[PDB]
Design a protein around this nucleic acid. Sequence first.
DNA 1: GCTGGCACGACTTTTGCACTATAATAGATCATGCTGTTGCACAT
Length: 45
Amino acid sequence: GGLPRVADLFEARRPKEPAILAEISGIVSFGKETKGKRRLVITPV
DNA sequence: GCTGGCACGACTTTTGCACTATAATAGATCATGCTGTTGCACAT
């Protein structure tokens, strides 16, 4: 907030916790072989 | 006859060659890109 943000908005700095989006058809895939790494690998056909 | 600016034979000055243990000091963030090390995923 405040206005170390008009600078922040114009610098196009990535936020700490970005939100991921999807594509044309996000069908259900949950996660195939969700190992100890990043789990729930979404694979919408 | 008296005087005041010009040259000459020693002396004097200039110039290239030329080689030569102790200590000011540390109190911003903030972001970005690169490098090295480690852990996750696949293969015979």
